[PDB]
TrEMBL record:
Subcellular location: Periplasm
Stated name of the protein: Thiol:disulfide interchange protein
GO molecular function: disulfide oxidoreductase activity
Domain named Thioredoxin: residues: 1-182
Keyword field: Disulfide bond, Periplasm, Redox-active center, Signal
Predominant localisation class: periplasm
Gene3D superfamilies in the cross-refs: Glutaredoxin (3.40.30.10)
Protein family (similarity comment): Belongs to the thioredoxin family. DsbA subfamily.
Gene Ontology cellular component list: periplasmic space
Amino acid sequence: HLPVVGEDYVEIPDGRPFAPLAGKIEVVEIFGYTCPHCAHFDSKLQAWGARQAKDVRFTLVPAVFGGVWDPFARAYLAADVLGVAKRSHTAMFEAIHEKGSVPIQNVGPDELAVFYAGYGVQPDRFVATFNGPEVEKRFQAARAYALKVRPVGTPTIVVNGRYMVTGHDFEDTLRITDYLVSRERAASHG
């Protein structure tokens, strides 16, 4: 069936995209590294991302959900600022969920710096970035976006800051996203 509001997605009141659209259809995944669903979804999601037309802006937004989520949100953002998020993303999920080489509980900048040291990031630079203003800015933006979006858990797909997918499984999630992306695209033609 075609996705139905309240079953397959919900509309975010006064929703605003994570970044200005500028002709684009924004598809955000709110994820956490600590989330095993996110870990499991990522390969399917990345493949989907690579399949999209150029008018799709696919953006990861880490879940700033408090507790254990926050260090990893900050980890992601620091990695991204440092240009090593994309190359380390799967590895970070694997480190947490498969290898157990990065702990969820009480993880800090020194476990994280060691991790990113593997991607050519100087540990002092990792720490400076992790503790720094650019990351804090992005962290607040991610937090604000989660407050606006109001996801229940992760992964959560959000189209144009307006439609939050509520899929039953990864494939359904992507199918509903496809529907919403196509619908935004059609809406752009008038």
